[PDB]
Amino acid sequence: GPMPKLADRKLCADQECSHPISMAVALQDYMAPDCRFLTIHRGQVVYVFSKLKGRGRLFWGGSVQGDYYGDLAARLGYFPSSIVREDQTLKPGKVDVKTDKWDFYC
């Protein structure tokens, strides 16, 4: 019935998933199929905050960098990991936590 969660568990840099795991650059375009996902275009910078596990492991969560130095969109959304190239690890994405009800809400 209701939209099933994309995953039951995820990997983060910390329990709250508030620190980014990595900085990545998009290699492919990706238009979000619904509000849970992030729309990205080749060349954009994405800060990765979560990596889903198990059934949702193709997808990562993060935010897109803006146009002025230092700008990161507030909105978090999911995207296929394969569309980006991770360029710098900021923190190990080792903290294994459960996804909550708010993770896939939009």
Say how far apart CA 86 and CA 48 lie, in whole Å. 9
How was this structure obtained?
X-ray
Contacts of 25 by beta carbon, 8 Å cutoff, 6+ apart: 43, 44, 45, 46, 84, 85, 87
- Measured distance CA(17)–CA(89) in Å, rounded: 15
Residue 73's identity, in one-letter code, is: A
Token pair 């990706």 is found at: 30
Resolution (A): 1.4
Read off φ and ψ for residue 41, nearest 5 degrees.
-125, 150
Q: What is the DSSP string of the chain?
A: -PPPPS-SEEEESSTT--S-SEEEEESS-B--SSTTBPPB-TT-EEEEEEEE-GGGTTEEEEEEB-SSTT-B-S--EEEEGGGEEEEEE-S---EEEE--SSTT--
Domains and CATH numbers, the chain: 1-106 (2.30.30.40)
